Design a protein around this ligand. Structure first.
Ligand SMILES: Nc1nc2c(ncn2[C@@H]2O[C@H](COP(=O)(O)OP(=O)(O)O)[C@@H](O)[C@H]2O)c(=O)[nH]1
Ligand SMILES: [Cl-]
Ligand SMILES: [Mg+2]
Ligand SMILES: [Mg+2]
Length: 398
């Protein structure tokens, strides 16, 4: 029949196939019937349907589970008809309108975020994404190969992730998005563009599979930053840090260090797949938090953060002046914590040409001492600065 209807039903099947085995078993079938038609068929009434399929087509029932061809056959057996309410009942249940398109109410639910508030995923939202990952990790490598990513995006109308995502979150030795990196990308997406995240949850059928009113049920909205500073206490799990410094001072090296990549692996990164964001889990005093690094290129929007990482290059006499300049310019009379990082510590330190030395600058403006850092290590770079950067974002008042 009409290709648009078949494409919609095909996607619905995929969403309904929660174990991604290519068939709908009795457990998945009953769930489907319950959300579409209130009540599932009796165990024998189900094998009656399966028999009807078996007598017409041979590839409609496999492991005593309904295949896509059998699913389409049913709706086709359902399409001779009069019968047309039952297919449309399924279509409407999965957010489609009369033109076989996902409704705006389904894809873009209303979610107002007050100023200076951030968006995170609740515990149940994460558990859904964890299930989503395992569903498509059919090789159990705890990573999504390009083929498995392609499989995951088959419910998407477009490819949601570019090749720069692999340079934004944790990947394995061959550049494949890790289970933890998968969660990080979703964490990153919810924080920066919650509207985009909700839309992606719609394509995955979050509200349907988890039986909630809207995709917005997955999002937790943190309280006002002003209150966090007043109470001197926050409940946020995700903190953003702006990385600021002159060109070629090693900012990109810092972001990639958070992902556990040393300098030479970073030299394997294609320039067209470069990312100006990096996010990974960080432990602070036994607490697991998310650190969100944003590489600010040297050029109110790009200053909003929970902590500032002022990076300078020790092999560059001109570099530290920028950190001083920007600090005085925007962060001197601010309650946002600042940390100075002496990047490229592996290189020979050159005398900085600023009027005051980096060390005394920190003590005068009552900042922590300049933090030595290098992403040029034999193994993975140290995550010390990231723990410290996160600790300061959690406790600015210290
Ligand atoms: N020796 C050494 N070189 C580094 C380090 N980090 C970056 N570099 C080099 O500095 C150059 C620019 O680094 P990059 O991070 O891209 O600078 P950015 O413009 O601030 O992002 C690159 O060619 C790197 O090879 C480091 O920790 N040690
Ligand atoms: Cl730059
Ligand atoms: Mg199945
Ligand atoms: Mg895999």
């Amino acid at each position: 029949m009409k290709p648009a209807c078949i494409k919609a039903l095909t996607r619905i099947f995929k969403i309904s196939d929660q174990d991604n085995d290519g068939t709908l078993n009795d457990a998945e079938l009953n769930f489907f019937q319950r959300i579409c038609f209130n009540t599932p068929l009796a165990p024998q009434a189900l094998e009656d349907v399966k028999n009807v399929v078996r007598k017409h087509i041979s590839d409609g029932v496999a492991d005593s589970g309904l295949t896509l061809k059998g699913f389409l056959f049913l709706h086709t057996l359902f399409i001779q008809r009069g019968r047309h309410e039952t297919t449309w009942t399924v279509l409407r249940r999965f957010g489609y309108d009369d033109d076989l398109d996902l409704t705006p109410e389904y894809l873009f639910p209303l979610l107002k975020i007050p100023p200076d508030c951030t968006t995170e995923l609740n515990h149940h939202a994460y558990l859904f994404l964890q299930s989503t990952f395992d569903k498509h990790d059919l090789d159990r490598d705890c990573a999504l190969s390009p083929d498995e990513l392609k499989d995951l995006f088959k419910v998407f109308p477009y490819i949601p992730w570019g090749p720069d995502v692999n340079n934004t979150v944790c990947t394995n030795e061959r550049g494949w998005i890790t289970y933890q990196g998968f969660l990080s990308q979703w964490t990153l997406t919810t924080y920066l563009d919650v509207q985009r995240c909700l839309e992606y949850l719609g394509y995955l059928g979050y509200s349907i599979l988890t039986e909630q009113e809207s995709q917005a049920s997955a999002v937790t909205v943190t309280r006002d930053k002003k209150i966090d500073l007043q109470k001197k206490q926050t409940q946020r799990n995700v903190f953003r840090c702006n990385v600021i410094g002159v060109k070629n001072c090693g900012k990109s090296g810092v972001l990639q260090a958070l992902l556990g990549r040393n300098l030479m692996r970073q030299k394997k990164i294609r320039e067209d797949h470069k990312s100006y964001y990096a996010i990974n889990t960080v432990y602070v005093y036994g607490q697991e938090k998310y650190l969100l690094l944003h590489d600010i290129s040297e050029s109110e929007a790009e200053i909003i953060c929970d902590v500032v990482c002022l990076v300078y290059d020790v092999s560059n006499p001109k570099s530290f002046e920028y950190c001083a300049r920007i600090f005085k310019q925007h962060f001197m009379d601010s309650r946002i914590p600042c940390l100075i990082v002496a990047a490229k510590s592996d290189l020979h330190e050159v005398k900085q040409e600023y009027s005051i030395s980096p060390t005394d600058f920190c003590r005068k403006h009552k900042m922590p001492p300049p933090q030595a850092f290098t992403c040029n290590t034999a193994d993975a770079p140290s995550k010390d600065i990231f723990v410290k950067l996160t600790t300061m974002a959690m406790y600015p008042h210290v």
